[PDB]
Scaffold this active site. Structure first.
Site, PDB file in Angstrom:
ATOM      1  N   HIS A 203      44.763  31.889  47.666  1.00 50.62           N
ATOM      2  CA  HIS A 203      44.487  31.185  46.409  1.00 50.62           C
ATOM      3  C   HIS A 203      45.740  30.582  45.794  1.00 50.62           C
ATOM      4  O   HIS A 203      45.657  29.680  44.967  1.00 50.62           O
ATOM      5  CB  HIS A 203      43.705  32.060  45.414  1.00 50.62           C
TER       6      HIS A 203
ATOM      7  N   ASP B  24      41.115  36.360  50.901  1.00 48.89           N
ATOM      8  CA  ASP B  24      42.245  35.834  50.141  1.00 48.89           C
ATOM      9  C   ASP B  24      43.535  36.262  50.824  1.00 48.89           C
ATOM     10  O   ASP B  24      44.237  37.170  50.378  1.00 48.89           O
ATOM     11  CB  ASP B  24      42.201  36.320  48.687  1.00 48.89           C
TER      12      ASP B  24
ATOM     13  N   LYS C  32      31.134  49.423  40.723  1.00 45.22           N
ATOM     14  CA  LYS C  32      30.552  49.765  39.422  1.00 45.22           C
ATOM     15  C   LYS C  32      31.156  48.952  38.288  1.00 45.22           C
ATOM     16  O   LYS C  32      30.476  48.630  37.320  1.00 45.22           O
ATOM     17  CB  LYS C  32      30.770  51.239  39.090  1.00 45.22           C
ATOM     18  N   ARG C  33      32.445  48.651  38.410  1.00 42.64           N
ATOM     19  CA  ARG C  33      33.188  47.934  37.377  1.00 42.64           C
ATOM     20  C   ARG C  33      33.046  46.418  37.462  1.00 42.64           C
ATOM     21  O   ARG C  33      33.364  45.721  36.502  1.00 42.64           O
ATOM     22  CB  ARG C  33      34.666  48.310  37.458  1.00 42.64           C
ATOM     23  N   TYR C  34      32.585  45.919  38.607  1.00 44.20           N
ATOM     24  CA  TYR C  34      32.389  44.482  38.814  1.00 44.20           C
ATOM     25  C   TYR C  34      30.955  44.193  39.262  1.00 44.20           C
ATOM     26  O   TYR C  34      30.717  43.756  40.389  1.00 44.20           O
ATOM     27  CB  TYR C  34      33.408  43.955  39.831  1.00 44.20           C
ATOM     28  N   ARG C  35      30.004  44.425  38.356  1.00 41.56           N
ATOM     29  CA  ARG C  35      28.571  44.310  38.692  1.00 41.56           C
ATOM     30  C   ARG C  35      28.138  42.896  39.075  1.00 41.56           C
ATOM     31  O   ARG C  35      27.147  42.722  39.793  1.00 41.56           O
ATOM     32  CB  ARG C  35      27.686  44.803  37.540  1.00 41.56           C
TER      33      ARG C  35
ATOM     34  N   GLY D 150      50.696  35.221  38.206  1.00 46.95           N
ATOM     35  CA  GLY D 150      52.032  35.099  38.786  1.00 46.95           C
ATOM     36  C   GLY D 150      52.390  36.204  39.762  1.00 46.95           C
ATOM     37  O   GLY D 150      53.359  36.074  40.508  1.00 46.95           O
TER      38      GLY D 150
ATOM     39  N   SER E 249      50.099  37.211  41.964  1.00 43.63           N
ATOM     40  CA  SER E 249      49.278  36.841  43.123  1.00 43.63           C
ATOM     41  C   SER E 249      50.075  36.718  44.405  1.00 43.63           C
ATOM     42  O   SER E 249      51.139  36.114  44.419  1.00 43.63           O
ATOM     43  CB  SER E 249      48.616  35.482  42.881  1.00 43.63           C
ATOM     44  N   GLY E 250      49.525  37.254  45.494  1.00 42.07           N
ATOM     45  CA  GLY E 250      50.124  37.110  46.807  1.00 42.07           C
ATOM     46  C   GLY E 250      51.165  38.165  47.131  1.00 42.07           C
ATOM     47  O   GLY E 250      51.515  38.344  48.291  1.00 42.07           O
TER      48      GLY E 250
HETATM   49  C1  LIG Z   1      46.189  37.458  40.070  1.00 40.41           C
HETATM   50  C2  LIG Z   1      45.584  38.017  38.831  1.00 40.41           C
HETATM   51  C3  LIG Z   1      45.407  37.255  37.746  1.00 40.41           C
HETATM   52  C4  LIG Z   1      44.797  37.836  36.526  1.00 40.41           C
HETATM   53  O1  LIG Z   1      44.631  37.133  35.532  1.00 40.41           O
HETATM   54  N1  LIG Z   1      44.442  39.168  36.597  1.00 40.41           N
HETATM   55  C5  LIG Z   1      44.636  39.972  37.727  1.00 40.41           C
HETATM   56  C6  LIG Z   1      44.263  41.299  37.693  1.00 40.41           C
HETATM   57  C7  LIG Z   1      44.447  42.085  38.814  1.00 40.41           C
HETATM   58  C8  LIG Z   1      44.999  41.539  39.954  1.00 40.41           C
HETATM   59 CL1  LIG Z   1      45.213  42.533  41.364  1.00 40.41          CL
HETATM   60  C9  LIG Z   1      45.381  40.210  39.978  1.00 40.41           C
HETATM   61  C10 LIG Z   1      45.198  39.422  38.856  1.00 40.41           C
END
Ligand SMILES: Cc1cc(=O)[nH]c2ccc(Cl)cc12
Ligand SMILES: Cc1cc(=O)[nH]c2ccc(Cl)cc12
Ligand SMILES: Cc1cc(=O)[nH]c2ccc(Cl)cc12
Lengths: 238, 238, 238
Positions: free
Chosen positions: C44, C93, C160-163, C186, C188-189
């Site tokens: 991403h 990803d 459970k947290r991401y239904r 920021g 990310s990756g």
């Molecule tokens: C990349 C990113 C952006 C964001 O806004 N929240 C996050 C929450 C958790 C993880 Cl692992 C990554 C992110």
């Protein structure tokens, strides 16, 4: 096998000796009985082999002296080499021999179990490499099947010892830091057999190393568990 | 289910009964809720089924007597059979039913978790097979959902009992040496559910065996963990 | 990184900062050295990136202030994005950067080991997320590389947290029930690094979450062990 000892007759009953008849008959490689019609071995064994007609598989052998013109053997119907194989040092060093006839199992000849994906977490502590190969880099085929107990080495450690190669998760290494025990020329394609919970498992296929039994140069073996899907696919009738 | 007992209402809330309406309505197979629109079951259940229009999935059932013309059910939008499936005894005995509507989860109907590849090493010691199938080889569909606790058997052991078959790593077996408890006709496609660390996991799908509950004939189940990649692939929208 | 602290110089020597030069130079994403010519990062990160020519990889960095016009960097020869990647929240990803030149390893820059399929059963208890990302949802890139120790959460719990999502076995989650520590924009990756048996393993790639460090919203990471076959395939020469 370097630094090994003579085996007891039939203590490795999955071990075969694969001979070529061309130009005259000689031991070529080791292999393992994994099914009634199936030998698992190393792809690199078939360099320059243009036909399965020149191959003979002998089971139930301790001494090469047992093999004469009148000794029974299994013909090879088909050689199946992994389609990604290019050479030993780049991995995919695995091949199947489909036999012309079926092996009748007995105390001297029976199949070794494949590793389970669930045993990937297992620390194998009782592993042996076997064969009729050289006892030193420049030598000759040995009469009596040799065995050597060798500890597995982590892939991280193995990679440290082979900086000019990529040691992949499809390889598994075994050796002593100080060397002294290892496979060598002629042991190719044979088993790295590990006994776990009273069952022998075919953990590796003897593939390559830099020299034989050198300090800081573990033997490199095909990691058989990474190929159980491939073996299943290739051993189905169609 | 042979040698089992009546279940407590809703103690297996992922268990469904799949009916066919042709020629008249009857229980066909078991299955498991694995997603809001998804039932996991056995491919062999759909022999001669030419359309999903004749299928009805009933959730939240204990007794078949609960099912009448006025009982609510889920229609089937699509039957997805593994592309390598040919028959139960050769493996790949797995299928997905995509439902026409979504299941609203409740105490009587909720999804069972799939096994994790990291639990391959786990020794499941609390495994149950469930269904409305026969209590003996020639019998009839049972009213009350039956359960039986059955121990898993190693693939090496299972292979010993089925010498005329190939018991692959994509199969998992369960049974008592002495027999007496097993799945039977009509239990096909239902779960082999194992509770580990207070979580129920869908370890197997009821597939086949020689007879029902015979001595030295473990039940053979689809090894679900070998298909989690396939399930993921097939349950994605496009 | 939310709720983290400043790192010790070089305690995360596989961590890189990936900059874009367009329109002017800025930190884009984190990444991890996994080979002499290879960075593993998140797909991403390359939204709207049309050429590798605008990318610069900096190794051996603690503070962004170290990076000036005269600071050495690695050019990017090729961006390899997983062919199934569509967006972070649907998985896949993962991306590789093939560098124009090779990294000379040293105390400040060295590769992190990939997880072993056999460690899938391991309970990683010492896991850290690192980066120069925001300390809160609306913030800015931080000068000093931050670290936070975060516990892994089961996929069942994460789901459970991401239904509204499908949390797949190709994802791994980490977070505190009460929130407070997490990756953010920021980060990310970059790596989710777990130390097990005195070896650091690249367990996850920082991918996404709903907000940053919120209660009952674990961070979602690419489950690297599910991609070791892909990494091997893509890092081979041809
Ligand atoms: C990349 C990113 C952006 C964001 O806004 N929240 C996050 C929450 C958790 C993880 Cl692992 C990554 C992110
Ligand atoms: C086959 C072979 C030839 C050789 O020269 N050295 C070796 C060292 C180790 C292993 Cl596992 C195999 C070999
Ligand atoms: C489906 C089925 C039919 C049968 O006759 N016997 C069986 C035995 C065991 C298992 Cl797991 C399934 C069956």
């Amino acid at each position: 096998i370097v630094g090994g000892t003579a085996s007891v007759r039939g203590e490795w009953p999955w071990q075969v000796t694969l001979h070529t008849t061309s130009p005259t008959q000689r031991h070529l490689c080791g292999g393992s009985i994994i099914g009634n019609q199936w030998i698992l071995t190393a792809a690199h064994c078939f360099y320059g082999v243009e036909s399965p007609k020149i191959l003979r598989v002998y089971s139930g052998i301790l001494n090469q002296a047992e093999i004469a013109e009148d000794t029974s053997f299994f013909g090879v119907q088909e050689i199946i080499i992994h389609d990604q194989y290019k050479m030993a040092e780049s991995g995919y060093d695995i091949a199947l021999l489909k036999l012309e006839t079926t092996v009748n199992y007995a105390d001297s000849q029976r199949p070794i179990s494949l590793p389970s994906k669930g045993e990937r977490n297992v620390i194998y502590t009782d592993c042996w490499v076997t064969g009729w190969g050289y006892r030193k880099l420049r030598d000759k085929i040995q009469n009596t099947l040799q065995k050597a107990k060798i500890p597995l080495v982590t892939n991280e450690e193995c990679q440290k010892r082979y900086r000019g190669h990529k040691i992949t998760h499809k390889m598994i290494c075994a050796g002593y830091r100080e060397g002294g025990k290892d496979a060598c020329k002629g042991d190719s394609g044979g088993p790295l057999s590990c006994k776990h919970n009273e069952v022998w498992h075919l953990v590796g296929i003897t593939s390559w190393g830099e020299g034989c039994a050198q300090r800081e140069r573990p033997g490199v073996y095909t990691n058989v568990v990474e190929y159980v899907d491939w073996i299943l696919e290739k051993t189905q009738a169609v």
